[PDB]
């Protein structure tokens, strides 16, 4: 891809709707990784 098609594909991927999650990173003293786990409500409400 070059600049024209890149910019219009960026525009067309901005056009629709999407959801983000926001983190506030800070130094922790060692490199690591973090996993994202969403939880769906149940009948009892417990995070099954």
């Amino acid at each position: 891809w070059t600049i024209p098609q890149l910019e219009e594909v960026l525009k067309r991927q901005r056009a629709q709707d999407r959801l983000f999650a926001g983190f506030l990173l800070h130094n922790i003293g060692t490199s690591a990784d973090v996993q994202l786990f969403i939880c769906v409500a149940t009948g009892n409400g417990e995070r099954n």
């Binding site: 070059t2 600049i3 024209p4 098609q5 910019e7 219009e8």
Partner: protein, 48 residues
């Protein structure tokens, strides 16, 4: 006609004209030739 962001320096029909020039036999030259004329007809014609 003026707004083809497919690439920043090459037109829509340039690829077609080089492809039509590539082959050697005259029948296939014609069969690669007519499409540029037809596409310009469709483009500049409008829906009138």
């Amino acid at each position: 006609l003026f707004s083809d962001p497919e690439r920043g320096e090459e037109s829509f029909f340039y690829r077609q004209i080089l492809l039509a020039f590539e082959q050697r036999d005259y029948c296939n030259f014609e069969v690669q030739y007519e499409v540029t004329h037809n596409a310009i007809h469709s483009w500049i014609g409008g829906t009138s």
